[PDB]
Amino acid sequence: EVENTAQKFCVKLDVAAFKPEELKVNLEGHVLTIEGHHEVKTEHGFSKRSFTRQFTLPKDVDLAHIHTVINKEGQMTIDAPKTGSNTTVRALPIHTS
Amino acid sequence: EVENTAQKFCVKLDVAAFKPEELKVNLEGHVLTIEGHHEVKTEHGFSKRSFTRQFTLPKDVDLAHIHTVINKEGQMTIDAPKTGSNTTVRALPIHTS
Amino acid sequence: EVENTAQKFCVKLDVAAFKPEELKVNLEGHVLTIEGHHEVKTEHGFSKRSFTRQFTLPKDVDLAHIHTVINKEGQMTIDAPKTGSNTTVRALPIHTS
Amino acid sequence: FEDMMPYWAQRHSMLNNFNNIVPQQLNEVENTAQKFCVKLDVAAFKPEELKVNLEGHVLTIEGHHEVKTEHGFSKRSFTRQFTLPKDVDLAHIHTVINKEGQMTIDAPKTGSNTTVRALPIHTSAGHAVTQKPSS
Amino acid sequence: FEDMMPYWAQRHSMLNNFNNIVPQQLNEVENTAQKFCVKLDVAAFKPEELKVNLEGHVLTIEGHHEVKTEHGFSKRSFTRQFTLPKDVDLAHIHTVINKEGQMTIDAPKTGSNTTVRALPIHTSAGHAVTQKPSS
Amino acid sequence: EVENTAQKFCVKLDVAAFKPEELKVNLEGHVLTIEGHHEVKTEHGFSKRSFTRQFTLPKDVDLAHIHTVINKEGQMTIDAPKTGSNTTVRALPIHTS
Amino acid sequence: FEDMMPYWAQRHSMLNNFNNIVPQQLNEVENTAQKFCVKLDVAAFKPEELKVNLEGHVLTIEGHHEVKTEHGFSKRSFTRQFTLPKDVDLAHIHTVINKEGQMTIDAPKTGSNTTVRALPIHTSAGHAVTQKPSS
Amino acid sequence: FEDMMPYWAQRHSMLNNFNNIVPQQLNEVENTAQKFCVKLDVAAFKPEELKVNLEGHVLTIEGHHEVKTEHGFSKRSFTRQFTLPKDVDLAHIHTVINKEGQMTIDAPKTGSNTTVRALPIHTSAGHAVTQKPSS
Amino acid sequence: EVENTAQKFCVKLDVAAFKPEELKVNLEGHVLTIEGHHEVKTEHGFSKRSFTRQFTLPKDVDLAHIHTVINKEGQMTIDAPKTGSNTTVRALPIHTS
Amino acid sequence: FEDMMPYWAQRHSMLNNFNNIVPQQLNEVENTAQKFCVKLDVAAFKPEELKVNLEGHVLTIEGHHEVKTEHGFSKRSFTRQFTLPKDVDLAHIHTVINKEGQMTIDAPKTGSNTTVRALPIHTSAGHAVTQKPSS
Amino acid sequence: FEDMMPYWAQRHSMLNNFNNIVPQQLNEVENTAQKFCVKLDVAAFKPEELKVNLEGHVLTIEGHHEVKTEHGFSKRSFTRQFTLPKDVDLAHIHTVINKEGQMTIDAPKTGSNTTVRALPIHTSAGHAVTQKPSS
Amino acid sequence: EVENTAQKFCVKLDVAAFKPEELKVNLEGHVLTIEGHHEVKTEHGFSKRSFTRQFTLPKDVDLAHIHTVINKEGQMTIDAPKTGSNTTVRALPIHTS
Amino acid sequence: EVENTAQKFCVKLDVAAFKPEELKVNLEGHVLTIEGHHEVKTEHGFSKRSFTRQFTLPKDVDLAHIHTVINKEGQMTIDAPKTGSNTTVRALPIHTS
Amino acid sequence: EVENTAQKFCVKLDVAAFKPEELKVNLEGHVLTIEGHHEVKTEHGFSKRSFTRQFTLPKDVDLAHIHTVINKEGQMTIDAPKTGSNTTVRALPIHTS
Amino acid sequence: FEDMMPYWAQRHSMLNNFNNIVPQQLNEVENTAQKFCVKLDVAAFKPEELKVNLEGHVLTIEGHHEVKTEHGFSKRSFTRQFTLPKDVDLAHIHTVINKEGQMTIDAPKTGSNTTVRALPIHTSAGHAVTQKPSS
Amino acid sequence: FEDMMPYWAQRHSMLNNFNNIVPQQLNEVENTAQKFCVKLDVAAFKPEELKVNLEGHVLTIEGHHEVKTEHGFSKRSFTRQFTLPKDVDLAHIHTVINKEGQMTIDAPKTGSNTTVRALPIHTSAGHAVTQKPSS
Amino acid sequence: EVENTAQKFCVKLDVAAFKPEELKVNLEGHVLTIEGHHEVKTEHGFSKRSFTRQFTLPKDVDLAHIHTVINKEGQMTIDAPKTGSNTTVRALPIHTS
């Protein structure tokens, strides 16, 4: 499950278990790869954690404008608007009687 | 369920529980978002209420002409005519024998 | 059920219960609205009657030529010929042997 | 006997006809020394669509109905009101709709009293079970 | 969630048990300045089986139930009565049974009045349609 | 549900809600009837409770030997052995190796 | 009786209506010498969607709900909080939701104590089996 | 993997075997400075059949089971009791039964406190919904 | 499951968890009842164990000859030969060519 | 609404009850300057079972009903008669049975005349088609 | 015998034929000292489509029929009228349509009187049940 | 529906509308007939009421012992015990612990 | 049923019951209407007969060339050739061996 | 359809159209035959009516006791009690409280 | 309309009733200057069961019917005869039975002649096809 | 024997063949002292399609047949006429069509008379039932 | 059934019963009509024979080239080649080894 509106392409993954500098995000044309590697010595030995998440973004997506952001909560979100639509927030004024 | 005639695009939501200045209406291209937030201290603590309503208006709709109006009854209605049709009220004269 | 021939668009509603000056007919593009309101004081209080009839005329109909007529019997009929056909009554002569 | 159906079944015929709204009836209000009758022809309305209220001696009957045609609609409303006389016993007022679809609001005057009220037991939202008379 | 059934469904278990008859409840009668509540556990009875009556200020709750076993039967009855205080508004008395099967007779005192009565519209014998509250 | 072994006929009913002296047990041939009546004045009026339980005992049952007993717990149990079998408790001695 | 369904069944009607969020209720908080009641109308929420927490004497009720329409959504949230009085026995606090969808948090004061706690036995994640009362 | 069934499924085998009653276990009671654990093998009992109670510091575990054979039956019971130390926080006591059928009553001592209680929301009679932990 | 041959009626129950003197075996005509009760004080309180096993022996069984025996292994076995057959062990001599 | 059936459907209940025979009714005969009403409760009889006759000014209502039980039967009869006043217009007399099963014989006096008679068109034996009123 | 159908069944054949409208018949009006007969061939009309009225001594027979073809229609009407002689007993006038579809309005003169009227019992709108003759 | 136990044959009919002296009960072997006739002059003429109820009692019933009784409530009940069973009411004494 | 060949559009109705001068034939574009009205005083009052037959001719039909003819037999026939085909009768000569 | 209770055998036929002296009833063992013949000269000739009704009475019926009676209404009824049951009318006395 | 069946369908009811044999009818023989009508009610007989013969001026109508009950039968017969007047045209005599089951023998007198005879074409044994009138 | 069908079954073969119209037959008219026979081969026509008429001594046989092919039709007609001699008894003339499809009009001369006429009983429009001869 | 090859349109009808000069063949565009009328006085009166055969030839057929020929055998055949194909008989020479 990924956010694939006609407007934009958004992907939310939790990566809280991994530290920001341990993560790698790569792009090979329309192929998005998110990798993670952990390595801490335990009391009696060591512990390792690894993951690789891969997405194939549709041809509609404008690849030049990709932003990858990890918030305070630890979760990483990747968003990229499709070619054609203008990513502009517009507040509508509220009128009464 | 939303009013989606070839003539116009109309949406009626009840927001009577929320005060007008607490509501926020935003537009991000063809994406319409209506948010609400309440926050009143109870006798023994506090009470919160929240909602987020999102619509995706079809490409037929003319986005420049969007009006958001909350009446005396408390219900908010959002209407926007589609590109092509002229929003004009025309009273027809009634003839007898 | 409405008369929708390729020739014309006709609508017959009975409105005998309502007086002619109490009725309102409006046009908003291809949307036809017929409203009625009655208000007479009864012996012990008052009586009210209300109705709203709405039609969506197809794009074939020529909106400039709409006629609304209430006859002696009390029934209202709304007719409008479609764009393309000539509304002309033509009596054909009857020949014998 | 094919036409064994609810009284409002034939209201789909009347999409364009607007005389079906509660018409004035023969002897609508009957005011005797015994009771205070109000008879209305609500045959165009489901019981679910009607509202009967009592604010003091003011009795209000209300009704609303909406149909959807292919591309349009057909709305129908009414609001009948009656101010009941001071001598009417407000406690024993009783509304009924027979299978023909004629509403009749029966409220007896203070003198001729039944003494007992058959209290309707409300079940779920908008539903109640009344005592059925037995021989 | 399998047990989405009427509250009286499990009364077939109780053929021999006779404690299911309306037991005395915690805070059965609640008498405030606002209202006069009566709460009963009628969970052993169908709403169709109960009778609620009001003769003056005397309120009576009645109930009867009969089952048929192979060769015998199991009858169960009750008759609860309450004399309502003079300050209670007899007109606005209102009985309800929730989905748990707890009857609650609510009758507000004369002071704190709602002013309007939602009159139940009686349909067929022993049935009525009430106004459902809307937002 | 009643205990109907070839050995005996037993019936257990809870009557804890009723006091012992309020209960009546009658026999009319093979027909057993258990009645109960309660009558206590409430604070605001009175409360009544009533029940009638009827059983039809099969022809196997020896009607002369019927015992009705209500224990400390409040539950009443009616037992009657069938004609043919001897109601005798016999403890079997336990042997080891 | 067709409407024998969960209380949240009719929440699909309310996609646009936002009054269904727990409204303020008549006699919401009941503070007697016996207990400390809190009654809320959570009828717009599945029990699975609600959270009830207790940090010291601070009691928090929380709820979240998301629907998906064809191309949009409809989110609804609340966060009710109550600070319980010092004399309330925190151990015996007990939350219930009846079939109508009314949550009621019952916590008795230290004096009037039941002495025994019916400990809920947790089965699988987010499920528990409680002792059902028997006669 | 065929044997994906409840832990009590194989109790029909044990009609004649009466060792299945909660046996004494390895390290049954674990009393650390952190918590007070009690672990029992209740694998012969449905969660519906067990009762866990707390009267003061006295904790009682109870269980009952009845089967019907063609012409006879097979009853099985137990009553385990534990008096919890004074330093145990009675409020946070928490009972669980894993899919193997091992009950474990966890009650932490006053010092090491979690501060928040995840209050179980009781739904219908004998059922409750707990907060499921999320990452 | 019980051993019900035309020859005899045998029942094997494990009672190893219970001590021999704690068990009770009773006979009420054709009804066999086996009860057990344990009661030992734990370190922190007490532990109880209880069971009741009931059998209905068919009318073929000769009730006078019932033997209840608990072996070294702890399991109790109840056997009783039916009326008609002689419970006699007879060793058959083995002949060769 | 399950009980959408003919009024005589529940007469199978009354095999032993013999009060269902047309009882005397409240305001049975109504004699105004306008009309001469006769109202009877024929709910125990099919319309096919009733006979209405007029010999001069003498009006006779008759009814007969037979059921077959396993080995016996249950007969029920009545014969009501009314002599109409001289001033009643015998031509316009009109009998109806509503869906509740209440017969009402309406015959207006000579003065207040409708002038037109809606003649019933007889189809097959014992059947006729009347003019249905239209708006 | 395949053609066991209503008399109007074959009217679908006659979309273009317009002689089927009640034609003048052999001995249409029969005026004897006994009765006053009127016989019409209404075979092109359902009984539901016909109207028979009586205003004083003026008798009117009316009929209307509409069919829908693919894109057009076929309307058919008539209006027959007869002024009955002064000596005809207006009370006993009786209209029938046999299975062939021939209407016959029978009204006997004052002298030769039957004395009793078999009053048609009206059931639902536009339906009535008449007394069937028995031997 | 009639009460047809192996013990007795009972029939309850409501006859409250009829006065006791207006009713007739006849027996023709195993055939029971209950007739009723009312005849009161109305204000404008007269009113009549009639009924005939017939039962066929099974051969088990002892016809000599038939009793017909109309109570205060107006309802008539006909009971007759079958040949074989003794119609004797026997109160069972209630014992406690 | 109407004669609708690619060649022509023909309609035969019997109108023998009506006199020629009583009939009216009208054309409103592609809509053909045939009306009839009779009115003769009977011996005892009067008799009326009425009919209205309506056809919608397809767009292929050439409306300028419509002929309505009532023969000696009384039946009226309306024919009109479609635009494209030449309405010409051509006798073919018959040759032998 | 004939009345065939275990008590009696009854047959009701309408013979009102025939005069009593024109009818013939015969018995040939268990076979019952009812014949009728009418013969009256009409104004222009004559009219005849004939019927023959035959019944086969079961072997239970006591043939010696057969009675054929035609009442004032014209209908003939044939009744005969079966061998075993006593045809005796017995009025039961009605008791009150 | 359920009773769309042959006129003789209900003769199975009349096994014991013997009035159904052609009864004398109102105006049975009609002797005008135009024709000589004979009308009979043969509703108890199939057309296949009737015989109509003409020996000189002597006209004979005959009929026979046999049913089989379980162990018995029910025979029914008639023999009606009429001597036609000398002035009746014997060639044009014509017998018909309408759907009600009323036979009518129509034979016009010599003066008023139709001139043409519609000769019935005999098909198979006991069957013929007549000219159906057309407009 | 597969060809057990009506004689006109094979007329669909003859769409283009027009010799099937009643051909002149061997000994078509047979005029003896006994009778006056006319034999025709009408095998191309259903009995329903033929007409036999008699105007005085002039006998006319007529026939018409229409088929519809995909886009065309095939009409076929005939009109045979015979003037019967003065000595032929016009009353006893009798037309038959055997299963081969050969019509034969038999009319005996005045001398050799049968004396009795078996009158055909007309049932429904265009149908009649004749007396079948029996041994 | 008619011969409708892509090559030609042929129709064979037997008309042997009719004489050649009695037949009429007409063409109204693509509609072919073949009529026949016979009229000979019989010995006792007269005999008539009539037929009308109608065909609708497809638009492929070349109407200018229609030939109607009645042979010695009496049968009439109508043939007309379609527009496009050349009606030419061509004998192919036969070669051997």
UniProtKB/Swiss-Prot annotation, chains D, E, G, H, J, K, O, P:
GO terms for molecular function: unfolded protein binding. Belongs to the small heat shock protein (HSP20) family. GO terms for cellular component: cytoplasm; cytosol; nucleus. Residues 16-124 form the sHSP domain. GO terms for biological process: determination of adult lifespan; embryo development ending in birth or egg hatching; protein metabolic process; protein refolding; response to heat. This is Stress-induced protein 1. The gene is sip-1. It comes from the Eukaryota. The lineage of its organism: Eukaryota, Metazoa, Ecdysozoa, Nematoda, Chromadorea. It comes from Caenorhabditis elegans.
